[PDB]
Amino acid sequence: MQAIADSFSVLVKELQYDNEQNLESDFVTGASQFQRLAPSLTVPPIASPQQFLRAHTDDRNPDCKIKIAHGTTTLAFRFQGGIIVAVDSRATAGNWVASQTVKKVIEINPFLLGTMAGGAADCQFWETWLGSQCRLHELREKERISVAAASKILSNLVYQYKGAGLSMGTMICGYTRKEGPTIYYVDSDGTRLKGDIFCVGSGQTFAYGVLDSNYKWDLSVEDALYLGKRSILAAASVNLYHVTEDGWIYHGNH
Amino acid sequence: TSIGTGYDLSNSVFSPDGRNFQVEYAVKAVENGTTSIGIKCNDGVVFAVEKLITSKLLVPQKNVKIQVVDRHIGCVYSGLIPDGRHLVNRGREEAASFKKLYKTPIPIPAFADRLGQYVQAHTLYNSVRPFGVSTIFGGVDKNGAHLYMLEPSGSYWGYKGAATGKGRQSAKAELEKLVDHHPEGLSAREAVKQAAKIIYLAHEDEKDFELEISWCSLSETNGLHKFVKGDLLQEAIDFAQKEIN
Amino acid sequence: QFNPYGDNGGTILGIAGEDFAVLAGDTRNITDYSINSRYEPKVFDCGDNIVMSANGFAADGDALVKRFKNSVKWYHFDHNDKKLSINSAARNIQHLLYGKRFFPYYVHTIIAGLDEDGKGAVYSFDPVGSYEREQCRAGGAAASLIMPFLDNQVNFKKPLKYLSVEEVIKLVRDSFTSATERHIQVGDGLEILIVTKDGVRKEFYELKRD
Amino acid sequence: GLSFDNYQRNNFLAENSHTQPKATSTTTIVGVKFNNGVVIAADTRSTQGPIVADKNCAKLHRISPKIWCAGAGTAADTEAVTQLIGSNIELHSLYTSREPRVVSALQMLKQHLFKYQGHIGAYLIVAGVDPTGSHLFSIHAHGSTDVGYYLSLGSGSLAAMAVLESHWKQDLTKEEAIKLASDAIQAGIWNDLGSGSNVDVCVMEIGKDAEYLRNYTP
Amino acid sequence: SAAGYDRHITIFSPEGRLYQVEYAFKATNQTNINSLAVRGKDCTVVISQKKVPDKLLDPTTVSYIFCISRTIGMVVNGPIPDARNAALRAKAEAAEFRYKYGYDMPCDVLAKRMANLSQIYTQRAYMRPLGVILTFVSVDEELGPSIYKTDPAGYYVGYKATATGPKQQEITTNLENHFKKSKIDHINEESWEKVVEFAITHMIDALGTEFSKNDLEVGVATKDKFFTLSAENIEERLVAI
Amino acid sequence: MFRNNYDGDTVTFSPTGRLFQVEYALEAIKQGSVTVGLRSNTHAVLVALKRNADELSSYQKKIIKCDEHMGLSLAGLAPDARVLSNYLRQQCNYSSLVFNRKLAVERAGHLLCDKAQKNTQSYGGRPYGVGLLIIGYDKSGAHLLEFQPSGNVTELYGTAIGARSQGAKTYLERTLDTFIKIDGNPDELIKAGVEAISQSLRDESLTVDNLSIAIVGKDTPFTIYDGEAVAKYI
Amino acid sequence: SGYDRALSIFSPDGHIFQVEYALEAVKRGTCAVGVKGKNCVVLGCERRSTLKLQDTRITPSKVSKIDSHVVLSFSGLNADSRILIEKARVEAQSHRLTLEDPVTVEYLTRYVAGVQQRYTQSGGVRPFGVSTLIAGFDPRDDEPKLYQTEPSGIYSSWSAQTIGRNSKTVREFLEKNYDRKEPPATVEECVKLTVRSLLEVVQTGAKNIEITVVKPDSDIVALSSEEINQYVTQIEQEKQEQQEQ
Amino acid sequence: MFLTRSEYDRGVSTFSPEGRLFQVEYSLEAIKLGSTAIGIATKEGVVLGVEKRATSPLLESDSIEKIVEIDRHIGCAMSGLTADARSMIEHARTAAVTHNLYYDEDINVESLTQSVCDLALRFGEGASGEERLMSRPFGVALLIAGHDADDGYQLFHAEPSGTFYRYNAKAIGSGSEGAQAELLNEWHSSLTLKEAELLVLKILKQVMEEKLDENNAQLSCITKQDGFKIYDNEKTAELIKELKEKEAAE
Amino acid sequence: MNIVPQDTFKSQVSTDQDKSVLSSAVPSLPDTLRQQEGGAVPLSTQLNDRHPLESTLKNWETTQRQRQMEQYRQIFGIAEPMKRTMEMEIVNRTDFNPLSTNGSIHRDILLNKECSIDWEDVYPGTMVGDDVHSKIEKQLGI
């Protein structure tokens, strides 16, 4: 009854601070905005938010435009005892100087990797979120999360926002004891595929042909690394990742 | 029988005689509070409060017993301090809302009605508690001077002179004598002196006390509510002391 | 249809040294072919030796800076007045930017400070949240007139590591003077904030518009 | 209440390959007030587009035994709104144990039509008698009402209004009012392609039962 | 006295009674004042007894008669806080009826509405009845002068004439005898002043010991307006017998 | 015996007209240690005697910083003190964010009174059981307030709350004009406060572990001294 | 004493009596035993003697398959077991839909325990008076899993556990006859041990015993009356031979 | 002057005449019914040790989990009701993971302890003003052992009352009095990791009615370079044998 | 003082906005199986292509009730809206009928709709859920 009396007792309405979400997002009552496991995304309070976003995202400061991951060639294959993930380190011109190579591959965990092949911010944000979810699952179940479970979580998440404006295509590669080495492709349209060989980017038909020429299950680590490097070069500075049951190992060019 | 067993452990309950015992217990709690009086003169109101002496550590100008709701409304209460503060806040909100909506100071009868409705709304459900305060308020509006007293039951009445607290009976007797001695009218300053005299008489029980007086009159305060300066307060205190002995 | 966005011009530049960082910006707020203000700072000291600047839509930048400052205040309240690192601040700004993914801020953000080891650090943020650490970054409608000047007069491979704070200030001033000569929007002032282990120092220079 | 489901599906079907079936769009309606009552008349011919569907259509709706109305626009909307208001009026009359008033039905219809912001296409002429007298009102589909002595509505409303302006006066009898309404409906029938056949008439007088006449012209 | 429960809420006793409703009914006579309502030829008159034991109390602020609307007046028997609560609710209900149905609220409809609210209070466990008795008087445009009384139990009924208070039996018997003698269910007088004088005389011969202008409160409802008389009007009516 | 039947909750009155649950909440203050507050025309200080569970334990934090110009010290329950401190921090943050205005000490006291009163009249929520001492500096100068959890706030030059706090109150009353006129010398005021709180000790001595100080002033922001920072005042 | 009237009241010694009362309600139910083997899990259940007119085609079984690899038996109130089983099945299907993987035994046990705990967190609700045994194998795993869940929401992992009426005798028998260092190697040994444990309390024998055997790769087999009768006859014959000499 | 019955110890929101909440006291009494947990903080790491009470030999040895990993740099030990401890542990893990997600750094042990205590405060009004979440207070006590760069190695004790303390050595559970006395007698700032482990084992053996071995006691440690790790049966058995040999020799 | 409802659009969205239906394996994601909506209904589709009158009709009596409460507050005071809301809340909270959806008689009396009919009254309108236990959990908050 006291709350009812206070509701009908008289500035805050104009500030819209009588709502919990506004106070939380402006960090008025505490840092609870940075404590949400599932983040809250602002949507325009209009009848056509999707058309509004699409119209305003195609209009002209180069710095104030949504960064898009370049359509560079990305390759992944599982031969006998791991997953080889190969990318090309060909930087793009810009008004900046890089202190290190461009991080075209996202390190989800010491055991999981992902590729951008889409919008940079979307991929980084949602793969960090997926890493947090996998860490929480591993803490709860006292066992490493399966690659299928992580891919399914990411697919469900990107499907819940289907058509809103997200644009991301990732390759989740992981080696578990129960399943072996597995590669999934998760698209922003809710697509979720499982495969042995994946090639994406501006040019991938040539790389896929090179792979099909010299692919077999009875390969070795050095042979697989050489095959990945050769495929990336033929599709054209080749960063390699070898994923085993103990985790992923990075090679600049070897 | 003032103790109704079996019908006094919840708020909204009728006794077999048709009485609410929680409200009567709230009235008994009020009766133990400090003595406060109000006198309605010809063109204004005067409020008087007996203030118990306290530690010297208190800031003299930051602890005033007489509360001001609006520029033309004065209010005092006897009972529980938190309930009195809550009621004063509600009254200030009501007065501000009325002034904003209708662009005129809220008339005293309308303010009294709103306050009484709010107080009475707390005797309808078992999840709340009746206000343990009795409030004497008043002021001046276009119709003249008004003085009202409001009880824990939500019942309010207009009075020529009102008194509440421990020494309510002696104060009421003195008010009746003053009314009898002034059948035609009473001036503001005479009302202030009589209020001081009544407050000093009401303290018959050992403990030193001070007196607070407040005016609200057209001739003196131009319709506003003011406190008492040093000269008038000293004169009233001296008159009360002379009347005592 | 009401258009909620706008543009106020302006140019900002962030450079990372070996033991210091520099963040500078032109202090002119302009609407379309009109000067709103000849001195309106766009670089702010956002707490524990961290400088932040959002360039583009002025209202969005002010809102983002305000939110980040409040978040820093609550961070100090929660954890024993712990000092906020530059990378944690970068991730906080990333989350703040991505929280408006479908109603984005129309700003480009640059922050500068010192890392845990003590070297200068500069982070750059696109409007939706994606960020990275860079040695030098220029934002606004003068970057194409500032970056080639820096690349000509210095090397990032005179190496940038051996530069002192005075030389960096001189290079920034020269580049902004050249941009002011060539570009209409740039001018009327230049404010530089230098972050070192001693704190944040502010300097101002008058450009060719008075 | 009314469902909004399959709205997106219907829009997709309309925009891709399918045509939504049309709804009947109801035709002259007239109301004339005489010294001791009101008369409400309507045409009886209903046509499905350019093809006549029926030569005897009952377009007179009943709200109360002494409060009647005739509607134009979407026939389903008119019928549904009239029936709902009639149920509300009956319940109110039972609750108050009194004869319903025309003003109450007018208020209910106006508020209901203003609730839907004109999405209910019913344009009504409401006549009746009650203890306060005889009343005649016109109600728009957006929730606006008007008061008059003689009213016309429908496709052939202009000819009916011309006839009413020709032969209306303050002091009229029941027979003269019925003849005037019949003449207005006949003019709408002859000079417009939207009206035809017979005329339905309802006469409501003070202190007497409402008289309903079907096919008055024969 | 209730045995177990029924001391707090409104549920059936083993005898099949609601004790809280009966206690609320008993609470209506605490004011120890009486009210009388009579019907004229085209008017209705309500007269209530004023008692001012405290000389400090302002007589002008003591009243139990309320103006619900332009045509309907109300008389409340019982404590004044519940009286004012019921008055405000009746005002709101009448205004809402006028807004919703396009014509003025009749007296009987308002009485039935208040009775339905009382039924809600008597059936719900967490709501208590109001210990007041309401009497609505008006001149309905379809029924002439009208008096309707509602009680805490949820029961309402119309009266040719009525009287409620601690001494209602005497006034009711006197009115019944007068109606039996005159064989009329109302008063055959064309002016409300004569009806007021008749009601004052009836109250005097029922209660006894007479009363002055400061011990009475009179309200008159006509077909146009309901109003409440002042001290001068009551005194002038007292002069005319 | 008769009191036992009318202390069920805060919505019940005794036949004599007493609200026993609020009285019990007020009595709960004595279970905490003693804190002293005192102010002059320029500065306001708080002195707290902290307690530990045992030798291996740490000491309770009895002084909490609410804003760069306002702070408080606790005496009583821990949960209610935490809740009220968080509420005051939220109010100060809201005021600064919306108006760029420092929240006044009197306004904080009024907000606390309004929040605390509502728990003493409704059902389902017990009253608060913590006394607070709030020091601050605003445009009206230095301010010290005593908050009693019944919903009361008093403005005073100096006071003390907690167990055995009557000696400190008597000392502050006696040496009133001495410590009132200490302007521009914060150390003298802090030493006066420590001497005042030393009157409430019983078989205990102030050490660097169980003594905490807080100070606020015209150019001095709200600062807390703990450990070696108070070693000069012992 | 007076501390057993609600789930939210602690006793002075530190007990919640309503939980103990729910356990007492559980203790009246029919016995249910679970035995973990080297490569199989055996769940045995005691059934009341069927009446002459009672149908024997449609009676619900004591052992229910929550999932193709996980089974669940209960003891206590038979009506609440249906609610718990339905919730467990729905959660298993939801987990398979959301993560593409069938639930582990511990995950389902934790979910059931969470539901039971959640039904103890309100004064207007009644906790489930059911104690459950959950058995199975993790997907693509050869490690038997057996868990026990209690009405309060507490679950534990066991190698051989009996719940229900007269469960103390069966528990003592298992403690004196089961050694974790040497679990039974074959399914037949586990079934024989379960039958011999159940025969300590079962008055009749083969017609009051139901047995379900779970083996990896989702092999759940419910034994028929003839097989249990054969086991009972063999056990009785061995017992008679041992008692003769 | 007659002896009646007082009922001020039955509601969580009812004060006693002296201003006490007896439901919190009874929750602590419920805590004292659990097994013993001992924590010792040194300059080389923090050692936690718990007692396993197997009511039946058929119970799984590793089924009992009184030591859990909140995060790689934060471990916890619990005494009391396991159902409430499950919710507390879930909340702590969620808070740590969310802090890592939003700040890209490890959360301070004191921050996590404060978060857990704020959760425990939910039987009344929350710290930020949230309404009540649970009908009764928790019946679990927690020992939280962590390491962070700001304050080194830390050990905290968390109670259902919502207040936490920092301890050099702490003991909770049934045998809390004797264990706490031993810790007070036998703790100094110069203890090493092995000395702390042996002391924990000695005190556990003292306060346990059953003979101490590898199947009824569990040890764990947290260090800077290794995080939080629980010893296996072999290592604990070797430590117990070494302690027995040292005791026999001296 | 509103006649047509305003501010009917969402300002923020998330994957856990529907607190009643959340997954247990991944608490940050919704449970598609227990939603029982069709299995292919993302939340984003609810933010676009809606009938303009749907929001007006869905929240219409609430707007009139709020305007009436505001008028009472302006003319009568805080007490009148406080009492009206208190009575309505008591009536709504006491009732619990898992097998029916029709409102109580006392609610209609308080709402002054004893003899009023709308299309909501005429038209009052699985594998999982829609049982007594789900409604009990929703009502009690467990």
From Swiss-Prot, chain A:
Q: What does this protein do?
A: The proteasome degrades poly-ubiquitinated proteins in the cytoplasm and in the nucleus. It is essential for the regulated turnover of proteins and for the removal of misfolded proteins. The proteasome is a multicatalytic proteinase complex that is characterized by its ability to cleave peptides with Arg, Phe, Tyr, Leu, and Glu adjacent to the leaving group at neutral or slightly basic pH. It has an ATP-dependent proteolytic activity. This unit is responsible of the chymotrypsin-like activity of the proteasome and is one of the principal target of the proteasome inhibitor bortezomib. This subunit is necessary for chymotryptic activity and degradation of ubiquitinated proteins.
Additional comment: The side chain of Thr-72 acts as a nucleophile, and the N-terminal amino group acts as a proton acceptor.
Record's InterPro entries? Ntn_hydrolases_N (IPR029055), Pept_T1A_subB (IPR000243), Proteasome_bsu_CS (IPR016050), Proteasome_sua/b (IPR001353), Proteasome_suB-type (IPR023333)
| GO biological process terms held by the UniProt record | proteasomal ubiquitin-independent protein catabolic process; proteasome core complex assembly; proteasome-mediated ubiquitin-dependent protein catabolic process
Catalytic activity entry: Cleavage of peptide bonds with very broad specificity
Task: Quote the PANTHER family the UniProt record gives.
Answer: METALLOPROTEASE TLDD (PTHR32194), PROTEASOME SUBUNIT BETA (PTHR32194:SF3)
Maturation-removed propeptide residues: 1-71
Q: What is its main location?
A: cytoplasm
One GO cellular component term noted in the UniProt record for this chain: nucleus
Q: Does the keyword rRNA-binding apply?
A: no
From Swiss-Prot, chain E:
Any Pfam family hit: Proteasome
| Classification via InterPro entries | Ntn_hydrolases_N (IPR029055), Proteasome_alpha (IPR050115), Proteasome_alpha-type (IPR023332), Proteasome_asu_N (IPR000426), Proteasome_sua/b (IPR001353), Proteasome_subunit_alpha6 (IPR034642)
Record keyword Nucleus present: yes
Alphabetical list of SMART domains matching this protein: Proteasome_A_N
- SUPFAM superfamilies in the record: N-terminal nucleophile aminohydrolases (Ntn hydrolases) (SSF56235)
GO BP terms: namely:
proteasomal ubiquitin-independent protein catabolic process; proteasome-mediated ubiquitin-dependent protein catabolic process
Q: Where does the UniProt entry say this protein principally localizes?
A: cytoplasm
Q: Where in the cell is the protein located?
A: Cytoplasm; Nucleus
Keyword list (alphabetical) reads: Acetylation, Cytoplasm, Isopeptide bond, Nucleus, Phosphoprotein, Proteasome, Ubl conjugation
Using the record, list the residue span of the signal peptide; answer none if the entry has no such feature.
Answer: none
- Where does the record put the Glycyl lysine isopeptide (Lys-Gly) (interchain with G-Cter in ubiquitin) cross-link? K225
**Gene Ontology cellular component annotations, sorted alphabetically:** mitochondrion; nucleus; proteasome complex; proteasome core complex, alpha-subunit complex
Q: Point out residues bearing the modification Phosphoserine.
A: S230
Function, as annotated, reads:
The proteasome degrades poly-ubiquitinated proteins in the cytoplasm and in the nucleus. It is essential for the regulated turnover of proteins and for the removal of misfolded proteins. The proteasome is a multicatalytic proteinase complex that is characterized by its ability to cleave peptides with Arg, Phe, Tyr, Leu, and Glu adjacent to the leaving group at neutral or slightly basic pH. It has an ATP-dependent proteolytic activity.
| Family according to the record | Belongs to the peptidase T1A family.
In its miscellaneous comment, the UniProt entry states: Present with 15200 molecules/cell in log phase SD medium.
Protein name as catalogued:
Proteasome subunit alpha type-1
From Swiss-Prot, chain G:
Primary localization class, coarse: cytoplasm
Q: Where is this region: Disordered?
A: 234-245
**Subcellular localization(s) per the UniProt record:** Cytoplasm; Nucleus
User: What is the recorded name of this protein?
Assistant: Proteasome subunit alpha type-4
Q: Which organism encodes this protein? A: Saccharomyces cerevisiae (strain ATCC 204508 / S288c)
Keywords on this record?
A: Cytoplasm, Nucleus, Phosphoprotein, Proteasome
CDD domains hit by this protein: proteasome_alpha_type_7 (cd03755)
Q: Cite the record's note on assembly.
A: The 26S proteasome consists of a 20S proteasome core and two 19S regulatory subunits. The 20S proteasome core is composed of 28 subunits that are arranged in four stacked rings, resulting in a barrel-shaped structure. The two end rings are each formed by seven alpha subunits, and the two central rings are each formed by seven beta subunits. The catalytic chamber with the active sites is on the inside of the barrel. Interacts with CIC1.
**Coiled-coil ranges from the UniProt annotation:** none
The similarity comment for this entry is: Belongs to the peptidase T1A family.
Annotated positions of the Phosphothreonine modification = T59
One GO term (biological process) = proteasome-mediated ubiquitin-dependent protein catabolic process
The answer to whether the entry has keyword Phosphoprotein is: yes
Function summary: The proteasome degrades poly-ubiquitinated proteins in the cytoplasm and in the nucleus. It is essential for the regulated turnover of proteins and for the removal of misfolded proteins. The proteasome is a multicatalytic proteinase complex that is characterized by its ability to cleave peptides with Arg, Phe, Tyr, Leu, and Glu adjacent to the leaving group at neutral or slightly basic pH. It has an ATP-dependent proteolytic activity.
Cite a single Pfam family from the UniProt record.
Answer: Proteasome
A Gene Ontology CC term for this entry?
nucleus
Basic and acidic residues compositional bias, start-end: 236-245
Protein's UniProt keywords contain Phosphoprotein: yes
- Supply the NCBIfam families for this chain: PRK03996.1
What is the primary gene name for this protein? PRE6
From Swiss-Prot, chain H:
Identify residues that carry Phosphoserine: S56
Name of the protein in question:
Proteasome subunit alpha type-5
Q: Which family does it belong to?
A: Belongs to the peptidase T1A family.
GO BP, one annotated term: proteasome-mediated ubiquitin-dependent protein catabolic process
| Cellular component, GO annotation | nucleus; proteasome complex; proteasome core complex, alpha-subunit complex; proteasome storage granule
Originating organism: Saccharomyces cerevisiae (strain ATCC 204508 / S288c)
- Record's subunit section: The 26S proteasome consists of a 20S proteasome core and two 19S regulatory subunits. The 20S proteasome core is composed of 28 subunits that are arranged in four stacked rings, resulting in a barrel-shaped structure. The two end rings are each formed by seven alpha subunits, and the two central rings are each formed by seven beta subunits. The catalytic chamber with the active sites is on the inside of the barrel.
Localization terms from the record? Cytoplasm; Nucleus
Looking up Pfam families in the UniProt record yields: Proteasome (PF00227), Proteasome_A_N (PF10584)
**Keywords of the record:** Cytoplasm, Nucleus, Phosphoprotein, Proteasome
Q: Which domain of life is it from?
A: Eukaryota
Q: Which InterPro entries match?
A: Ntn_hydrolases_N (IPR029055), Proteasome_alpha (IPR050115), Proteasome_alpha-type (IPR023332), Proteasome_alpha_type_5 (IPR033812), Proteasome_asu_N (IPR000426), Proteasome_sua/b (IPR001353)
Chief location category: cytoplasm
List Phosphothreonine occurrences by residue.
T55
* Additional notes on this entry: Present with 17100 molecules/cell in log phase SD medium.
Q: What is the lineage of its organism?
A: Eukaryota, Fungi, Dikarya, Ascomycota, Saccharomycotina
